[PDB]
Amino acid sequence: RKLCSLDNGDCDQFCHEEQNSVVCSCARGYTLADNGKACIPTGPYPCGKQTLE
């Protein structure tokens, strides 16, 4: 397929085709990385992560 249908558009989390091309976004507690794809936890115990410590 194409765009978001193609490996989630290379996004870590949310993917949506805006005006063609791809646009990635993140859940609450995360901030989109510089590459506009990865999602960086904005603090300890971000949502959806199993806890190690």
Binding site: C4, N8, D12, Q13, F14, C15, H16, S25, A27, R28, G29, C39, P44, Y45, P46, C47, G48, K49, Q50, T51, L52, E53
Partner: protein, 234 residues
């Protein structure tokens, strides 16, 4: 949970347990944030008054990480119906904030469209809880988890003696003896995506437990995302 494995240290941190006057867990819940818990609306009738315990994995000990929380506000969906278990969803607002830590963390809320096309199209999801390990057995003392395959909606409906509304979905196996069970209700059904777990459902109901030709029925969380956000804003 029938079958499946028990949640090891830190594997099911978003799991919440509702306890009665007797400190007995009757239902599960999912941590959405420091103040909110997601659960089944039908669970709100299985106890006249209850509290919320998080960070617990063995209900007959004290790992020291357990924490009891009192419910400040109970936000039930005004369209829930005991007759069909439709709109089986509710949000709990806690009096005091949850302190995230080992075994105590929230699951992420996805966006409707992305969730439906990417999370729910995945092979499996994961349900967990302190419910029975056998249809007739007693509540489990150790928290368990089970990987349950998403079930084709068609099969789902054809296999159900009860109406499967659009606020529901099937997960589980046709004949394999693994499924959620009584007590896991209101609990978490989360789907994994790149190591991040998203809330995709609420343990709702089933005809018995792990019965052949039957599946586990969950509340389709994606159908209540707006409602959930509204509930949390206030």
């Amino acid at each position: 949970i029938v079958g499946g494995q028990e949640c090891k240290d830190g594997e099911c941190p978003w799991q919440a347990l509702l306890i009665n006057e007797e400190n007995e867990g009757f239902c599960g819940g999912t941590i959405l944030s420091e103040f909110y818990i997601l659960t089944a609306a039908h669970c709100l009738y299985q106890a006249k008054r209850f509290k919320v315990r998080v960070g617990d994995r063995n209900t007959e000990q004290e790992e020291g990480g357990e924490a009891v929380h009192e419910v400040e506000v109970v936000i039930k969906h005004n369209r829930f119906t005991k007759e069909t278990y439709d709109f089986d969803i509710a949000v709990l607002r806690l009096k005091t904030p949850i302190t995230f830590r080992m075994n105590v963390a929230p699951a992420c809320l996805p966006e409707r469209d992305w969730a439906e096309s990417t999370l729910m199209t995945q092979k499996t999801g994961i349900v967990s809880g302190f419910g029975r390990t056998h249809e007739k057995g007693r509540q489990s003392t150790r928290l368990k988890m089970l990987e349950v395959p998403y079930v084709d909606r068609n099969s789902c409906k054809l296999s159900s003696s009860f109406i499967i509304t659009q606020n529901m979905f099937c997960a589980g196996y046709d004949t394999k003896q693994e499924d959620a069970c009584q007590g896991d209700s209101g609990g978490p059904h989360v789907t994994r995506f790149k190591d991040t777990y998203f809330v995709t459902g609420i343990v709702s109901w089933g005809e018995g437990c792990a019965r052949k030709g039957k599946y586990g029925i969950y509340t389709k969380v994606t159908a209540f995302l707006k409602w959930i956000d509204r509930s949390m804003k206030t």
